RNA sequence: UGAGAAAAGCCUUCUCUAGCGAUC
């Protein structure tokens, strides 16, 4: 990135995703989705999420990357809010109660927000989370109810 | 779509369970027999 | 909800505050189960 | 309590122990393959 | 029941009259220390026992003779120590011996058991309970380094 | 059978069974079993805990530490002392309740509630507090054991159409609490009153609008819903009603305006009102707008409902310099006349100033 | 009262004797002798046992409060 | 056999073992 092309870079970046195929990868693909907004633009951090959607090794920190991206774009498509959301509690929605929080608050923060749906969302929140995750998201939003957050 | 008229459905299926066990709520608290207080004090004008 | 024939509430005879002479019978009825083995005493 | 195992033992018992954890990272391999080719196929059942 | 638990504070009585003799307590003072014994008393007849229970215990009776002590010196008062001090001191020993016998695997207990010796007890008595811990505990040398320290 | 009933009438808390035997424990954590097994040094060890984890979220607890959580309320048992210390002790447990309310989900509340019931028994002393503290989270499971530790099998009680929750071990159904609130006047009573007692209880401490906000969003739910609810809404609803309606008008908290806003509007759209009462209740509406400036708008769009669903000529001329007075009164309404009809205000107003001018 | 001798008062040895485990080391002394551990243990214990559990807003319907001994046996 | 016989739910009176307790 420093001293070379900007093609360059990406091809070093496709030879990195072919040879580490384990859980290596995914430190791997967080900086490449880093660096496509920088080089690129927002067309350009999209097609890169279109094609790793799909390679199952992830993290959240995938996801709310590509959040931040939409948030700091003028369009901030609500709809495509939902849409990554969606992906990254299909993945991590049976641990993860903060992902889960942000989620809510997403629909009552947000101008174009429904908070409507977040009769849904808890309701959708008790049952996926198992064990002491479940009593996790419990506090944690009897805490956001009261101003502590 | 369709997943998300589901939750809908299976939301309102388990209220409706539990309102069938909660009950209508239309009956109120039954009446009680009253029985007057004894030995009350009061006060007579005539002595003044 | 009226009752007739009634009689006042006295001792049962088959009480175990009586002692067992003085009881009358246990008033037990045995039936051998199907499912129940058998066993006997037999000397060879 | 165990007795002491020799040293062509438990040689045996790793390279046993090595296939496993190596049919196990094949297989979460194999899961990952499926649900890649689920949602390229029939999307809509697999979010259902 | 309580046949133990009464011997108990019949013999606990006497040094209390004495202190109220001493005008270092008040009645009611006197009356609260009953109840607060009695029931601390019946916490460790019980057929179930608990080594928190002695803690207790002890802890209220270390309680107890810091106070008496810190009230001596204000009222400048230095008689009849054996009647009061040693009395409370037999009581906890023979307290610490039970509980001892009762939890033998117990270090700790153990320590303690060897500081209140220390703090309050003639040194024959921590030379015993000494002797009594390297009894079962020769596995130790730590113990060994502190019985020779000593 | 006339003496059992005389006898079980004559029953009173103080001479409680349980008091004279351990053989069966009220406890909120622990089966009885189980919480017949433990001394008073444990409860007292874990309701101070978790008081302990409560100061560090909350300071304002910090003045429960010396009646509630001390050795003196170790020692205290309620039935030797007189009725004027039982009257203390439960003014002090209901504030102690009003500032537990918002926290009721978290552990460190729960302990606490079961200290109080294991040292008080508020379940036999304080029935009514520990209802209105626990009412707003009905739909969840703790309010169920909460209700399981009372004793409402009699089917005189005051609590008795909370029977089922107890038996059957579910959480209270929203239709079952609407139906009784709009059917049964003395709830609702109660639900306004807790409303109202619990607003002047946390007005004093700043910057404590927050802890209002769940219990507010249930006061605002539910009497809707029960204006919804209700066939006919005769008269004493509204006589009802009236009151609070216009100590909520009256209040600073944004929250309690705004559901007052929301059953004035409700009540607006479903009877018909009396001509008085609509030239009343919108002058108190347009008398108090400018004390929040954050809710000036709302407050005029509610107006707008207030004249479009009763008579054309129900408001009179007195409120009229009131609401001419009112900062930036066009803007707002040319801002409401962006997205929303705003015919009824100005057809009222524009009579009143051409005689004005 | 670990290491608190009277040879420290008179200061013979420039050095005491040191036995290698310390009282913070181990859990402490269990009585205090001046102006609660266990007392913990015994409350975590008990928290555990606790019929307030993960999964409490899971299950559907609450066990009962109380049983009669004859619909137990 | 003849408080006829048969079944369900609530109180009362008591019986057995098995740990536990006695070490100061």
Redesign the interface.
Same mark, same amino acid.
């Given at each position: 990135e420093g001293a070379k092309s900007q093609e360059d870079t990406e091809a070093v970046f496709k030879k990195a995703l072919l040879a580490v195929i384990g859980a290596d990868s995914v430190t791997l693909k967080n900086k490449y989705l880093d660096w496509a907004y920088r080089s690129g633009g927002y067309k350009k951090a999209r097609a890169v999420f279109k094609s790793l959607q799909e390679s199952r090794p992830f993290s959240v920190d995938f996801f709310r990357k590509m959040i931040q991206f939409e948030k700091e774009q003028e369009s901030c498509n609500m709809a495509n809010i939902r849409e990554y959301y969606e992906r990254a509690l299909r993945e991590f929605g049976s641990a993860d109660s903060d992902l889960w929080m942000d989620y809510m608050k997403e629909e009552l923060n947000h101008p174009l927000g429904r908070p409507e749906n977040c009769g849904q969302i808890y309701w959708r929140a008790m049952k996926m989370l198992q064990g002491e995750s479940a009593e996790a998201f419990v506090a944690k939003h009897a805490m956001h109810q009261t101003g502590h957050l | 779509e369709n997943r998300a008229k589901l939750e809908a459905r299976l939301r309102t299926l388990e209220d409706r369970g539990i309102r069938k066990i909660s009950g209508t709520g239309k009956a109120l608290a039954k009446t009680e027999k009253y029985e007057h207080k004894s030995e009350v004090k009061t006060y007579d004008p005539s002595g003044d | 909800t009226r009752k007739y024939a009634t009689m006042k509430r006295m001792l049962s005879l088959r009480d175990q505050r009586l002692k067992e002479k003085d009881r009358l019978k246990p008033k037990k009825k045995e039936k051998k189960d199907p499912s129940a083995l058998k066993e006997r005493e037999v000397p060879q | 309590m165990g007795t002491e195992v020799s040293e062509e033992d438990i040689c045996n018992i790793l390279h046993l122990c090595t296939q496993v954890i190596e049919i196990s990272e094949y297989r979460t391999q194999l899961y990952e393959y499926l649900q890649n080719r689920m949602m390229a196929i029939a999307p809509n059942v697999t979010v259902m | 029941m309580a046949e133990i638990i009464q011997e108990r504070i019949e013999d606990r009585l006497p040094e209390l009259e004495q202190l109220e003799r001493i005008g270092l307590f008040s009645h009611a003072e006197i009356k609260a220390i009953i109840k607060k014994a009695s029931d601390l008393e019946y916490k460790i007849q019980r057929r179930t026992l608990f $080594?928190?229970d002695f803690?207790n215990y =002890?802890?209220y009776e270390?309680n107890l003779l810091?106070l008496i002590q810190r009230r001596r010196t204000r009222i400048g008062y230095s008689f009849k120590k054996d009647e009061i001090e040693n009395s409370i001191v037999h009581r906890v020993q023979g307290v610490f011996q039970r509980a001892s016998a009762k939890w033998k695997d117990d =270090?700790?207990?153990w320590?303690?058991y060897v *500081?209140?010796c220390?703090?309050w007890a003639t040194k024959t008595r921590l030379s015993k309970v000494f002797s009594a811990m390297l009894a079962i505990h020769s596995n130790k040398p *730590?113990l060994w380094?502190?019985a *020779? $320290?000593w | 059978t006339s003496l059992a009933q005389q006898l079980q009438r004559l029953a009173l808390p103080q001479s409680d069974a349980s008091l004279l035997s351990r053989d069966e424990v009220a406890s909120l954590l622990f089966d009885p079993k189980e919480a017949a097994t433990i001394d008073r040094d444990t409860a007292f060890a874990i309701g101070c805990t978790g008081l302990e984890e409560l100061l560090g979220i909350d300071p304002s607890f910090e003045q429960f530490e010396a009646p509630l959580f001390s050795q003196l309320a170790k020692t205290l048992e309620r039935s030797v002392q007189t009725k004027a210390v039982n009257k203390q002790l439960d003014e002090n447990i209901s504030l102690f309740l009003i500032h537990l309310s918002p926290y009721f989900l978290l552990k460190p509340a729960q302990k606490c509630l079961e200290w109080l019931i294991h040292r008080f028994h508020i379940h036999l002393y304080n029935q009514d507090s520990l209802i209105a503290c626990v009412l707003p989270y009905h739909e969840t499971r703790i309010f169920v054991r909460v209700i399981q530790l009372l004793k409402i099998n009699n089917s005189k009680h005051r609590w008795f159409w909370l029977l089922p929750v107890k038996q059957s071990g579910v959480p209270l159904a929203k239709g079952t609490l609407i139906t009784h609130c709009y059917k049964d006047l003395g709830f609702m009573d109660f639900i306004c009153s807790l409303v109202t007692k619990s607003v002047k209880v946390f007005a004093e401490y700043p910057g404590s609008s927050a802890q209002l906000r769940v219990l507010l969003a249930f006061y605002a739910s539910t009497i809707v819903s029960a204006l919804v609810a209700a066939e006919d809404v005769s008269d004493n609803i509204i006589a009802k009603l009236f009151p609070y309606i216009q100590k909520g008008l009256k209040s600073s908290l944004p929250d309690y305006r705004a559901a007052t806003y929301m059953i004035i509007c409700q009540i607006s759209v479903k009877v018909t009102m009396e001509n008085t009462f609509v030239n009343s209740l919108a002058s108190q509406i347009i008398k108090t707008l400018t004390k929040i400036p954050s809710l000036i708008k709302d407050g005029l769009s509610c107006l707008i409902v207030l004249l479009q669903r009763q008579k054309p000529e129900s408001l009179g001329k007195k409120p009229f310099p009131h609401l001419c007075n009112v900062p930036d009164l066009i803007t707002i309404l040319h801002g409401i006349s962006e997205t929303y009809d705003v015919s009824p205000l100005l057809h009222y107003m524009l009579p009143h100033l051409v005689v004005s001018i | &009262?670990?290491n608190s001798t009277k040879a420290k008062l008179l200061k013979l040895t420039s050095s005491?004797?040191?036995?290698?485990?310390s /009282?913070k080391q181990? +859990? +402490?002394?269990?009585?205090? &002798?001046?102006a609660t551990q /266990?007392?913990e243990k015994?409350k975590n214990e008990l928290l555990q046992k606790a019929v307030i559990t993960p999964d409490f807003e899971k299950n559907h319907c609450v066990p009962p409060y109380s049983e009669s001994k004859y619909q137990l046996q």
């Open positions: - | - | - | - | $080594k928190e803690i =002890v802890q270390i810091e =270090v700790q207990l320590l303690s *500081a209140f220390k703090k *730590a380094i502190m *020779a $320290k | - | &009262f670990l005491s004797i040191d036995p290698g485990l /009282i181990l +859990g +402490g002394l269990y009585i205090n &002798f001046n /266990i007392k015994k």
